[PDB]
Amino acid sequence: NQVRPKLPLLKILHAAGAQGEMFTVKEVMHYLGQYIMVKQLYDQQEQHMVYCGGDLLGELLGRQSFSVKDPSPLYDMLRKNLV
Numbered sequence: 425n426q427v428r429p430k431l432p433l434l435k436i437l438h439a440a441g442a443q444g445e446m447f448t449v450k451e452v453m454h455y456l457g458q459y460i461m462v463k464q465l466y467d468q469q470e471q472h473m474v475y476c477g478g479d480l481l482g483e484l485l486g487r488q489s490f491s492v493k494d495p496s497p498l499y500d501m502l503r504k505n506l507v
């Protein structure tokens with residue numbers, strides 16, 4: 425059960441060490457979490473909060489920040505970026 429991430433999401437996964445074009449959603453989500461850490465987008469003082477307005481991840485979410493505790497914007501992003 426592989427999808428192909430569209431370029432902007434693919435760039436993001438590759439930026440977290442992913443290789444290739446095809447992934448399971450499990451992989452996608454794991455690399456996304458790693459990306460947030462690699463790029464230090466989460467707040468060390470509020471570790472469920474991600475400030476992504478200056479990052480490609482924000483453009484994809486269409487949001488400047490989100491909470492991993494209530495991660496609503498993620499779902500549509502994945503629908504739009506996974507073929």
Ligand SMILES: CN(C)CCCN(C)[C@H]1CCN(C(=O)c2[nH]c3cc(Cl)ccc3c2-c2c(-c3ccccc3)ncn2Cc2ccc(Cl)cc2)C1
Pocket residue numbers: 453454456457458460461466471472473492495498
């Ligand atoms: C600063 N630390 C607190 C981070 C702990 C990270 N941790 C060990 C890993 C284990 C597998 N994880 C994930 O699969 C995971 N994937 C993500 C993908 C996104 Cl877009 C957002 C959050 C997470 C995300 C994730 C996060 C998270 C939080 C801050 C920075 C990076 C990742 N925390 C919990 N999760 C699990 C999760 C998965 C999916 C959703 Cl929708 C929500 C939460 C997190």
Ligand SMILES: CN(C)CCCN(C)[C@H]1CCN(C(=O)c2[nH]c3cc(Cl)ccc3c2-c2c(-c3ccccc3)ncn2Cc2ccc(Cl)cc2)C1
Pocket residue numbers: 426427428449499500501502503504505506507
């Ligand atoms: C706007 N268009 C560009 C949309 C075309 C979409 N389409 C034709 C169907 C075909 C069947 N699909 C799914 O089962 C599927 N649909 C979703 C819708 C959303 Cl908002 C989020 C994830 C998935 C989601 C999904 C997938 C996935 C991956 C690749 C291709 C299709 C679907 N993988 C996991 N999910 C669901 C999901 C929901 C929440 C979380 Cl936290 C993680 C995964 C997609």
